[PDB]
Coordinates of C-alpha atoms in Angstrom, one line a residue:
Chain A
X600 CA -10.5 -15.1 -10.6
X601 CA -12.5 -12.8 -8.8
X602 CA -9.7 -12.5 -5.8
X603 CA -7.0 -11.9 -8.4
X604 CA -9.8 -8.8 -9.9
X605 CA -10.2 -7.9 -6.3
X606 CA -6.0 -6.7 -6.5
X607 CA -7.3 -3.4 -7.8
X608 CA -10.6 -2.6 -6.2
X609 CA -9.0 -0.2 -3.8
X610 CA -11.9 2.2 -4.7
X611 CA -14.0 4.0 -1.9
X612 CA -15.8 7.3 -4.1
X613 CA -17.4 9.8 -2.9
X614 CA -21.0 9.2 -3.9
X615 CA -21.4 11.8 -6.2
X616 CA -18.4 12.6 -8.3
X617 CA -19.3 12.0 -12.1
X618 CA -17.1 10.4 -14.4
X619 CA -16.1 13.3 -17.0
X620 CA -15.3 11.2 -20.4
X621 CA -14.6 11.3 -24.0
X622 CA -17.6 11.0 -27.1
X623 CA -16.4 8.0 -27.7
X624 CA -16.4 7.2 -23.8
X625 CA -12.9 6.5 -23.0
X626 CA -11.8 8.4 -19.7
X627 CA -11.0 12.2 -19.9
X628 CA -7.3 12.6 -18.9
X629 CA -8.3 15.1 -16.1
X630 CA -10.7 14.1 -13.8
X631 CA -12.0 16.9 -11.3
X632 CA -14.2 17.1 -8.0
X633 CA -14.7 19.6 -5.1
X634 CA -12.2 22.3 -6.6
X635 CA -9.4 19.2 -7.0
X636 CA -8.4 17.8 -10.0
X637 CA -6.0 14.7 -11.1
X638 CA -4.9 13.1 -14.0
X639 CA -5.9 9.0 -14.5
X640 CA -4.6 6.7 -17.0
X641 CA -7.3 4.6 -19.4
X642 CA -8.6 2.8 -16.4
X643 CA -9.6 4.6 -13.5
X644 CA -6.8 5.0 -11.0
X645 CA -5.2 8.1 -10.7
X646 CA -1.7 8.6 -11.0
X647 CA 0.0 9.4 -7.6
X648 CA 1.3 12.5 -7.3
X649 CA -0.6 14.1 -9.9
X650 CA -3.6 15.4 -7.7
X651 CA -3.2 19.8 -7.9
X652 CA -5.0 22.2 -6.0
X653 CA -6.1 24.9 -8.2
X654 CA -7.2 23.2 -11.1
X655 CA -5.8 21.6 -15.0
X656 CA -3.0 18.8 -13.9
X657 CA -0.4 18.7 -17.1
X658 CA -0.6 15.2 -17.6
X659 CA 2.4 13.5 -17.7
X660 CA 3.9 12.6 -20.8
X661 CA 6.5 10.0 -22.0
X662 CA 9.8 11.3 -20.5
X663 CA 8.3 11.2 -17.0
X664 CA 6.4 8.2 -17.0
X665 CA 9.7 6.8 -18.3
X666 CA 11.8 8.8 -15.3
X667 CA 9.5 7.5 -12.6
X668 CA 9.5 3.7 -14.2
X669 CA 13.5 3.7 -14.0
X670 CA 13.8 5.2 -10.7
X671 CA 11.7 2.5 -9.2
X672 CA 13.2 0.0 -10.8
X673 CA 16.7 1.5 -9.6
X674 CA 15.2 1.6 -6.0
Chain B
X600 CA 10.0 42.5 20.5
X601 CA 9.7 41.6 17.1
X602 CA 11.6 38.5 17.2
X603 CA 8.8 37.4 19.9
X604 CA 5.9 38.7 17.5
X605 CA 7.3 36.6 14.4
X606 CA 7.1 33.3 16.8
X607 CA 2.9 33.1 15.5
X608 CA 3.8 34.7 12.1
X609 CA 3.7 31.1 10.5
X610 CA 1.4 31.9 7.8
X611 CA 2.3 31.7 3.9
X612 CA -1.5 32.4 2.1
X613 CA -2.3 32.5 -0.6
X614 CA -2.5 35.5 -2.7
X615 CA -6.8 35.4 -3.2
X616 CA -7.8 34.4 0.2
X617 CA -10.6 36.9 1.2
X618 CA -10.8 36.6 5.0
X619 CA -15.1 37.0 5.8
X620 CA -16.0 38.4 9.1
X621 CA -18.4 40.1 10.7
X622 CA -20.3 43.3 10.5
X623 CA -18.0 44.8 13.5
X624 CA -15.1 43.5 11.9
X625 CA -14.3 39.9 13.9
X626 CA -13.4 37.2 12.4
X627 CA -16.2 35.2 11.1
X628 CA -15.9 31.7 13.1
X629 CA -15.1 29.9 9.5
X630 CA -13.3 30.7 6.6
X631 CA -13.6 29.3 3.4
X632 CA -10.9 28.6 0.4
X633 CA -10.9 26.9 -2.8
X634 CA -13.3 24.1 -1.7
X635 CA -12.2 24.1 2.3
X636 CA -13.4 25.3 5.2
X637 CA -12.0 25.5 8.6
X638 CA -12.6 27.3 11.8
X639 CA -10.6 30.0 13.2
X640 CA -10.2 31.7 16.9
X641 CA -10.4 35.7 17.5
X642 CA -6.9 35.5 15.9
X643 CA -6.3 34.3 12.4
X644 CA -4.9 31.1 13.2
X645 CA -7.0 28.1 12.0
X646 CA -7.6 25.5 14.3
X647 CA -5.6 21.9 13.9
X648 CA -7.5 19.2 12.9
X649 CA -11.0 21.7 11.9
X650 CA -10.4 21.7 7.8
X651 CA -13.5 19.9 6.6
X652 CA -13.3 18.7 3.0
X653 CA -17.2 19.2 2.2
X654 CA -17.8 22.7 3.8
X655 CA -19.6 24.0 7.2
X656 CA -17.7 22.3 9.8
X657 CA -19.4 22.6 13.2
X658 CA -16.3 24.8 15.0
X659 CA -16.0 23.1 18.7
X660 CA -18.0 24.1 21.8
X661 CA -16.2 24.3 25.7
X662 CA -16.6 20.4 26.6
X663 CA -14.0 19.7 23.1
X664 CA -11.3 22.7 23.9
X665 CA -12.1 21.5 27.4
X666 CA -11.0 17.7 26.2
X667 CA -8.2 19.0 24.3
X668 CA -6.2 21.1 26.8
X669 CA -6.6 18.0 29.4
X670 CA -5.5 15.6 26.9
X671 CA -2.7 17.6 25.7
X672 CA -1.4 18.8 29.5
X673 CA -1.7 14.7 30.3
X674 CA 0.4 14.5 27.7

């Protein structure tokens, strides 16, 4: 169990970047640090690609999360 | 004589880059950018390799242009 958990613990933070998140507590959709921001899904991995330089990612919505799934699977 | 002059004119900035430097007007020995910092020459050309992501970097001495010029004429 813990070597199939260990599939998505490619995580090496920075000590100090705080988690921004909801009232509720589910993850904000931007997550910033250092003057770079990125968009993350409801766990914590950000989505590749999405990582700006100024500042405020547009998070992807369905179309392009659809695009990217059927170009992958067409690859 | 221009067509020589535009072979270091490789430089697309950005439009809000402030260049600091001194009170005689040379180029301060790092410049700072949304977050970055890097180390520069006399000329505006940054050094490879000097962009720190945390800030300050330590710009290099004689012994590491020294150890770069050997390695690279070894090459």
């Amino acid at each position: 169990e813990t070597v199939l958990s260990s599939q998505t613990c490619e995580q090496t933070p920075e000590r100090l970047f705080v988690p921004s998140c909801t009232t509720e507590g589910s993850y904000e959709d931007v997550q910033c640090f250092s003057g770079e921001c990125w968009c993350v899904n409801s766990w914590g991995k950000e989505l590749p690609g999405s990582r700006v330089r100024g500042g405020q990612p547009r998070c992807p919505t369905d179309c392009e999360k659809q695009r990217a799934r059927m170009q992958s699977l067409m690859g």
